Amino acid sequence: GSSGSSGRETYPDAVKICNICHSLLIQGQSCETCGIRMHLPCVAKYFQSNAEPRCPHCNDYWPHEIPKSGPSSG
């Protein structure tokens, strides 16, 4: 016998991954429709110069607001 189990999700970079760059993030924007996090400069870069933003995952609608971009990439 001497069996064992574990019910805890503990990963170094397997908990909150971006949807634009796919990089471990901590603070940003998440979707309540499906459940995906995105960086600040990532969410905007995807919802820049548009009318109605759509989650890059479920593709329904962005419940949160759209962040601003920086002087980078242009």
Q: H or E element: which one contains 29? A: strand 29-30
Nearest to 64 by CA among 29, 25, 17, 19: 29
Distance CA 64, CA 53 (A): 10
Q: Which backbone phi and psi does 59 adopt, to 5 degrees?
A: 70, 50
Question: Considering the complex, what minimum distance in angstroms separates the CB of residue 4 from Zn ion?
Answer: 36
Q: Which of 58, 61, 63, 65 binds Zn ion (CB under 5 A)?
A: 58
Contact map string, positions 11 to 30, toward Zn ion, x by CB under 5 A: -------x-xx---------
Q: Which of 24, 30, 33, 67 binds Zn ion (CB under 5 A)?
A: 33
The site for Zn ion (CB under 5 A) is made up of 18, 20-21, 31, 33-34, 39, 42, 55, 57-58
